[PDB]
Design a protein around this nucleic acid. Structure first.
Lengths: 432, 433, 432, 433
RNA sequence: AAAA
RNA sequence: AAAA
């Protein structure tokens, strides 16, 4: 699929001009139609500062004000149906009002909005126009885009293109070129940051330090995370470090993560105080880095949900998951470890032995030394450490064992072992 | 070490105002003086456009014009003179002149300038102002900065803050708060690009086919790089895939890399046509990604040169190299692979034995089943595959061999083994792109 | 997406040989593993005669028995898990049982199974091995394939390869070459056949002619088609005759067709009577031409479902639909008819005129007494006949009307006119 | 006119059994005699494989060997002798002989043979028995039979029946029913392939690269075709796109097509080497797609030759040509386009005017805006584009012009216009394939 | 500093 | 007539 994203400031103040792009031309106030004409995008996203709001009756008339005029202006140069408009929280003192809050709220808001727009199935061709963007909103939208596409690139080929028109000078300008300023094949970057201390999800901007602790206490999300924090970090680490069995057993609940974000998003919006008489907007809650981590964590889950196979987790299903999830030397380490356990399984099968609920140490044949679950041996052996993994071969009549053993040999962690891996992997994500 | 980077438009056009930042308060036309009082940087870096220039009798009269205008403005404001100015090649048609060329030239030019300014030793605390910038110079300066910092973070701690000012309103503005819009523990990202085809170092923006063919053909770079592509790619992959022995053996000649980058940067600069009468700059060559890859490659080599040593490579030295370069599960598999070779060394030492120039397979005592060198085995075993490595224990009277064999056990690739690995790692680096 | 279709008789009776294919070499009793080696198919299909079945307890133990034996034969040569298996209704009097019914049942059964396997999105590379096939099963599978790929080819590029190994002769054969006997780029062939009379969907093979009229009466499919027979034929004609507006207005309800085909495929299979003691299957119903026409009709709907827009239908969309749907002179007729109406809308626009709900004849400016709607003018003017079409120009403040007019000028058929066009097109489909 | 085609393998290995067909019952080894009793065909065709041959002293001894065996088997059984035996080039190593060559040859040889047996005048009811056939000869014969009947269906009604018998089981079988596995109205499909590049008429299977190029260079066909290629594609386009004027002015020389096919056939055959001692056949040449395209191009010419007439072409003639060749919405546009010019010729006639050698643009009443000949306007207006057609009104005393103007208004392409159309239609056929 |  |  093809996606086009553009950073806009104040669109009603631009001038009619002609643009050249991809051996084609167009005449109007915006770059959008000629971009839409060449790229033929399957979807188009517009990111504005909500700073343009004229009527402050309250938050919903502001987001209505802006959307109305974007919809009017989008008719005025035929920008089509297939459009989303991300009306972001910008700040400062202006002609027709005043907005206040954390400057980083836009990053987290644009990140949350794009995480709900960017296709999670299939390949991506992303197009970005920095022409007409506010300097800080363009830079935050650029970062937010690249952060999620980095996570998409794990499962899919992602090519990114960015455009900036030649500078418009109102006196000399005949025609402005749409230059390609960047064209890159996005590199796979799985989420590599742990969930933070419970301060960093929502922070107070200008809300009294006693009122905050009241509302933080009241939230469901934060207390449900206190529980799940370690298992989520265990899953994040599973992609980072090449732990295919931990990836499956720790797969997060997408609908529950959806809930956490919704509650934090509407909580952040429910602390936006609008004074109609001072034409003043104060966003009393600031988004925290942990809101960013959760958005990315959920996005990463959607991208990889296709791999969550039915139990029991066989050697064959684990090869299959690994081939998609891992690259470079990590993939090759995982193929070797599964190789050992498979090659042994094939030995057992030719002797008519089908061990059920047998320790991986006893399955591979280990002398009773060490038996301590080291960070070293968990991370070094694709999380398939011998003191934490139960093995079972569903008994069957073999004709081609070198083929079958992959299907009939299943791995799961022991309940004790899983808590040791969870602790080890969580801890490794924090020394990062 | 703190570094302050500011992205700057047409500075002579900015209005006087007040700035709030870090409990401090400032009056001026620019954010630079207050950022320097608060952040107290060890070096300031101003990045801005060619397109400010107004004298067109040459390129060196266009740059010395802009440099002198910046210096004169730095005095007008309470700004220091511990500053590097990067005059980036911009594009468009202006009232005072015309600049034509590749848009992407700015990125590669700034990437080149920053690569020689950003410290290669010690930790970095990088501060970036995007208040005054041209959206397209700012984005490219941002992109360029982060790309190098990601390489800097392989060896050192790199934290990154960006700042942008409240938007200025011609006569609604009393004071602008300089807001913090980003703070980042920069993650390690070793170079993951292979070196590209020989079309992609310089390209003709506006040059006759035949004339460009003569230039391309005259470059010592595209000649030396044709034979040396494989070895440089093998080294790139050594960091990426966790191969500490290959890291040392393939360690690039920094001199030869400087030569290549200088030559290409000269050729590009020398092809800048400035027409005095009609006031129009044409950059007849454009920088390719090949140039970008080399700038980063050299930077990665500069960043990691503190680890290189002479040809005897001890399992102890491999352990120490490995803990600097590698992280997560890459480091731990390396430690395990070095563990099983060190342990075998300790078994040999107690028996009073010290083999020399012995295939690692015969040292570990493998079957004769498989001698074919697979990508699987090379990458899976931190590049220390039994069929390509030659072990040499240097005889010593043992007494605590558990803590000693490390220093006296030396690893090396056989000449045949090194070519087999070079091909595997180079092909591996091109299939993961 | 690559696709391998192999036609099999009695796999248990083939002898172990070696095969040469694409410089590669392989040993064993079937062409299938070397075929999957060289072609690397994304999916594989196996078409068998169910006349190899042995256990006659009921229908679902024959397909079970057959499926198990196939699944074991694959397990024994290495064919992987990426395999659908079409067990097709054959006939004849065999060693281990007897099978009676319509021989053409095999055609429609395979057509129906292939219509739910062949991708209905993107290009196709199709590989067909005719080596080990029953003679009439291979000839019917080959036809059902080409007939569907012909419809797939309307929207996407479809290359077709056919292979046959050198004849096996059990005494002298060292190695058999796998010869390519056909290599074709499938030409686009829209459904060109009308829906028949209500006799020709299911027919009695061995059902007394009174018990039949009983079941035909109860089928919902036949009672619904009676209404929609003309709407569906109007649509079939729309692709055949180059009528872009009628393609959108008459686009079939896909869920509604899906259900018609399932009622007829479970009715046909409801009337398969096994006699476990006599070991004699009798398929008391036989699929008719009407079933086949519905399968091709549904497949063509799927292949082209991506073009369906939301009303109203602009000139711009009718250009877009047409570029995808139509080729040769038929496209250029459509582009000229949309050209005239667009150029008229430009003239109206430049004068600040924007007529709504106006007859096309009045919009274009026609003399009277030519209100008779003829098959000639409907087909000759891409279904955009002056007395059956209404034009609406949505009012906009023009700037470059040569660009704008395309988006703001919308066409629909009047409710009177649509019926005239439906009648005309349906009739034109029957004279074919 | 009825036609019975049957795919046979080795007919001397068939058992005896009972056959049910058309109410009747028959005893013997072949389904053929009962197929002839019931269907009562005008002509019968037997397609069988080369591989049945046993005498290897020559290639005509091998075909005279095979034919004899067939004729004698047509006596053992109560069959007719009013028959055609297409002896197709088979492939495989057998107990009695070894045959080598392209497997695809048999399609082209059968397509060729059928092109000269299928009647090219009046309707066709075609019957095909796949009971006794080799799986690959049956598919190729079916494909080749459909390919030809599709071109035949342009001009006449073509219904197709295909039969196959209940599977024969050694000792379980008593009576085998002959099942109708297909009954079709063969849809009209005019040739829609352009003539290919000159790689793809004859290719070397087992011919030394040199020996082939001497042969290829000795061929008249390739030389004559390179120069007639475009005008043949123009004609192929005329039927496909509905251009009735172009169809007449580009109607091929059937004699030169007959010529091209025989030279290629006799070359393909004259390069079959047959070694008598080691009983080996090698067809060192292989037929290409281009040979197939010519066999169909000629067949289409034969099928549509009924319509051609001398150089003056009238609007009445163009109506009747169009009525026979074209269908659906293509026919109706041709009628509407011929309707315009005719309706205008009647306005001219009532005034007593009869223009000669006048451009269609000046005849209809056009501006000077666009004289440029577009693919769009050529294909959309049935090839009767305004800047390439010249109308001549043959002066007559009108008395009911609305019935007469048809016979007395003639259309011709201008020398410059015809080349502009040939180019357009030729290239249009190449983009659509 | 909401196309330097 | 279940790789003539």
């Amino acid at each position: 699929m093809k996606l086009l994203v553009v950073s806009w400031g104040d669109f009603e103040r631009w001038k009619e001009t002609k643009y050249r792009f991809g051996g084609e031309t167009s005449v109007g106030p915006s770059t959008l139609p000629i971009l839409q004409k060449v790229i033929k995008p399957d979807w188009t996203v517009i990111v504005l500062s909500d700073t343009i709001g004229k009527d402050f009756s309250s938050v919903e008339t502001l987001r209505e004000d802006v959307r109305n005029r974007v919809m009017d202006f989008l008719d005025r140069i035929g920008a089509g149906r297939e459009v989303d408009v991300i009306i972001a929280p910008g700040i400062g003192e202006f002609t027709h009002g005043s907005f206040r809050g954390s400057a980083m709220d836009a990053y987290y808001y644009v990140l949350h909005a794009l995480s709900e727009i960017i296709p999670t199935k299939g390949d991506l061709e992303v197009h970005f126009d920095s022409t007409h963007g506010l300097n800080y909103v363009t830079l935050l939208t650029y970062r937010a885009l690249k952060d999620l596409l980095g996570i998409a690139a794990v499962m899919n080929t992602v090519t990114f293109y960015a455009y900036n028109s030649d500078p418009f000078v109102p006196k000399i300008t005949k025609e402005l070129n749409i230059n390609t300023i960047e064209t890159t094949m996005v590199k796979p970057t799985p989420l590599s940051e742990p969930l933070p201390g419970f301060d960093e999800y929502l922070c107070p901007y200008s809300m009294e330090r006693a009122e905050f602790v009241r509302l933080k206490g009241s939230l469901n999300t934060l207390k449900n995370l206190r529980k799940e924090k370690k298992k989520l970090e265990a899953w994040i680490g599973s992609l980072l470090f090449g732990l295919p069995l931990l990836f499956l057993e720790e797969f997060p609940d997408i609908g529950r993560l959806e809930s956490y974000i919704e509650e934090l998003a509407e909580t952040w919006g429910g602390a936006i105080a609008v004074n109609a008489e001072e034409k003043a907007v104060t966003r009393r809650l600031a988004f925290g880095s942990g809101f960013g981590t959760l958005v990315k964590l959920l996005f990463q889950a959607r991208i990889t949900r296709g791999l969550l196979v039915e139990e029991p987790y066989s050697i064959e299903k684990l090869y299959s998951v690994s081939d998609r999830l891992f690259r470079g030397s990590t993939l090759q380490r995982v193929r070797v470890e599964l190789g050992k356990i498979e090659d042994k399984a094939i030995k057992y099968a030719r002797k008519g032995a089908f061990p059920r609920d047998i320790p991986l140490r006893d399955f591979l044949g280990f002398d009773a030394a060490n038996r301590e679950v080291s960070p070293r041996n968990v991370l070094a052996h694709a999380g398939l450490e011998a003191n934490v993994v139960e093995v079972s071969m569903e008994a069957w009549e073999p004709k081609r064992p070198e083929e079958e053993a992959g299907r009939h040999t299943h791995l799961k962690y022991t309940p004790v072992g899983l808590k040791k891996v969870e602790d080890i992997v969580s801890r490794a994500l924090k020394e990062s």
